[PDB]
């Protein structure tokens, strides 16, 4: 996250971090056992780690939990980044509480304008590199259709949105990929792309989560 | 097109 703050030790209890040996993406608990993330974040043999501020440190509410299953996009498509969503289940199920908790998916589509929460601990530079040890957090806009298309021309799908700032400045980042996009309490996006990071003209693009639901709900009911 | 995996989508 750049051009973010310190979100606080535990104040977004749905944050996860995918950990192979380092934190490599994030993701988004939506019940005790199912995690949503980006489909590019998909890699053999996860940790989950969740309940984490201090990524580098064990501050004591951490959960590590392995990935048992990892659901990838039938549709997906790496080249295009169209439906950009994975479903990761855990091996055993998360102990919710105050610190680890579910975020609700939506119910409908969010609008342009709507004010969202993007957390994660990816690069807070979009020149060179810096990285956090604890949680970063940007409130950051939804922007309308026609504004995603000409910042990115034949690149935005239906299932994308972008949100930021084209100032430049206040955007998600490498190491923010799978996290969430929170809006009116509801999981509308996942971090996917952008061009650099907080560049002029050049805002976060992100997985568009209500297209998804029903296919959500029927891939936790079969596994 | 850049994916936002640290520390790159390309890098692994
Ligand atoms: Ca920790």
Known sequence: ?223 | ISARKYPSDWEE
Request: glycine fraction near 12%; include cysteine.
């Open chain 1, 1 to 223: 996250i750049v051009g973010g703050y310190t979100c606080g030790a535990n104040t977004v209890p749905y944050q996860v971090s995918l950990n192979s040996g380092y934190h490599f993406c994030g993701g988004s608990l939506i019940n005790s056992q199912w995690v949503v993330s980006a489909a590019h974040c998909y890699k053999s043999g996860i940790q989950v780690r969740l309940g984490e501020d201090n990524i580098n440190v064990v501050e004591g509410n951490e959960q590590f939990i392995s990935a048992s299953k990892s659901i990838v996009h039938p549709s997906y498509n790496s080249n295009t980044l169209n439906n950009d969503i994975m479903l990761i289940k855990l091996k055993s199920a998360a102990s919710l509480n105050s610190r680890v908790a579910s975020i609700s998916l939506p119910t409908s589509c969010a609008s342009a304008g709507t004010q969202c929460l993007i957390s994660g601990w990816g690069n807070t530079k979009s020149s060179g590199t810096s990285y956090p040890d604890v949680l970063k957090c940007l409130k950051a806009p939804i922007l309308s259709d026609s504004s995603c298309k000409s910042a990115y021309p034949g690149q935005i799908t239906s299932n994308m949105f972008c949100a930021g700032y084209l100032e430049g400045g206040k955007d998600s980042c490498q190491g923010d990929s799978g996290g969430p996009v929170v809006c009116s309490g509801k999981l509308q996006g996942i971090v996917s792309w952008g061009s650099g990071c907080a560049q002029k003209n050049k805002p976060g693009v992100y997985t568009k989560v209500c297209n998804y639901v029903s296919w959500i709900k029927q891939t936790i009911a079969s596994n």
